[PDB]
From a paper:
PolD is an unusual archaeal replicative DNA polymerase (DNAP) in that it has all the functional properties of a replicative DNAP but with a catalytic core reminiscent of an RNA polymerase (RNAP). PolD is a heterodimeric replicative DNAP composed of a large catalytic subunit (DP2) and a smaller subunit with 3′-5′ proofreading exonuclease activity (DP1). A characteristic of PolD is that the exonuclease and polymerase active sites are hosted by two distinct subunits. Indeed, PolD has been shown to share an unexpected structural homology with the “two-double-psi β-barrel” (DPBB) family of RNAPs, which includes multisubunit transcriptases from all domains of life, homodimeric RNA silencing pathway RNAPs, and atypical RNAPs encoded by some viruses.
In order to prevent DNA degradation during cryo-EM preparation, the exonuclease-deficient variant PolD (DP1 H451A) was used in this experiment. The structure of the DP1 H451A (144–619) individual subunit was solved separately using X-ray crystallography at 2.6-Å resolution, ensuring that neither the overall structure of DP1 nor its two metal ion–binding sites are altered by the H451A mutation. All the density accounting for DP1 could be conveniently interpreted by rigid-body fitting the DP1 H451A individual crystal structure, with the DP1 EM and crystal structures showing only little differences. DP1 shows an oligonucleotide binding (OB) domain that is inserted within the N-terminal region of a large Mre11-like nuclease phosphodiesterase domain (PDE) whose active site entry faces the 3′ end of the nascent DNA strand. Second, the Mre11-like DP1 nuclease differs from the DnaQ-like exonuclease domains found in most DNAPs showing proofreading activity. Indeed, PDE domains are encountered in a wide range of hydrolases, but their dedication to DNAP-associated proofreading is specific to PolD.
Author numbering: 152 to 163, 174 to 206, 225 to 619
Write the structure that this text describes.
Amino acid sequence: VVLDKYGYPILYYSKYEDVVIEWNPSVTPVQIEKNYEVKFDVRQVVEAYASLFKSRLSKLKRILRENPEISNVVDIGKLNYVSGDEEVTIIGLVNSKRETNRGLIFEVEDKTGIVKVFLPKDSEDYREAFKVLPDAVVAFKGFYSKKGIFFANKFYLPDVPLYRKQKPPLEEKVYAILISDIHVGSREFCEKAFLKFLEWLNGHVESKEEEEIVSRVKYLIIAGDVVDGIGIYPGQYSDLVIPDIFDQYEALANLLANVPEHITMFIGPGNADAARPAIPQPEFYKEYAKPIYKLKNAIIISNPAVIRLHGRDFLIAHGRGIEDVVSFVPGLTHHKPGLPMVELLKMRHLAPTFGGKVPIAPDPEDLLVIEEVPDLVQMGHVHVYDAVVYRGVQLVNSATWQAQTEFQKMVNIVPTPAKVPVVDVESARVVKVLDFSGWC
Ligand SMILES: C[As](C)(=O)[O-]
Ligand SMILES: [Fe+3]
Ligand SMILES: [Zn+2]
């Protein structure tokens, strides 16, 4: 039985009040100038979705036009004023996508019209066109039939540039720790493993290599599902140790209060959090999440957000789009969220698909478009660790602190709890993975 305060689910144990972890005096932190900036945050800004699709198409059409190979772009509404002898390019939204034994049939839409696009079974770009999600913005080079079909010979994605200038080296080596899906309130929350991680952060390490990493750790990024929430799925009460949303954030803040003062924490919301029930999520609902807002070394970031650390762009998103990729693309699955994350980077959109459990807000501007090329992309949500480099961009899933729940077992989700990516800010790369799973 769920309860509501002003409409929101609030309720249906210890809150780590006693938890006190002090810094190890034996370890001295390396004195580095903290160079950080929230480069992008959601808060820095008839048909309900008309303005959103206009914004999405306009933004991604700009990214496609930056490809030197994309030329002779013509409006879809002008396609039969074009003779069948002229090779043209069209840019538009993938409205529909259907496979025949003879190839792929797309319904592509721009600001001027809609057209049926055919791509033959084995056009060298087929593998990519077979993977593209609907409501993504793509380009097609080909000829118009005059029967109503665009016979494409080439398919293009917004993508990331193959060549980008290397960044100047930093004065000192600085590390960033990536975590997500803590799920405080769940019986499956790896409580001891997380306490051992807080000890590790406070210089309580047993090797010299770890000691030189801990001394240089200045940033901690939390990519959503910081609490387990209330009424997220039917039967969730059976798994909750803390069945109160206020007490979940209070328990979380009591743990996060034990994060060293020299570490700047960037905390973003997820789908389990007391935040907007659609994406993008500006922040957390301050009425429920107040205890984390009061942490001295914490900065509440939006979902999505872009954090510039020492000149390196870290794009932080919860990871709702990984689900869209695994459902729509056969062959791609969890156990490896790295490849689905590459597809979102290539589409330059975090969650293009409409209709899923993935609620996309009918906002005026599409803030889910990856407008600028990041150095690192951090996502959570799927509860499986992975890391892959695509064209100099590090794609990384920060896993979870939650062991396999009853519900996860049923929907065949196999998590990799307590696996912590260690990021070298200079190269914006995962250099080590801390494994605290022995405590699970
Ligand atoms: C429990 As979940 C799959 O919403 O991180
Ligand atoms: Fe989660
Ligand atoms: Zn989630």
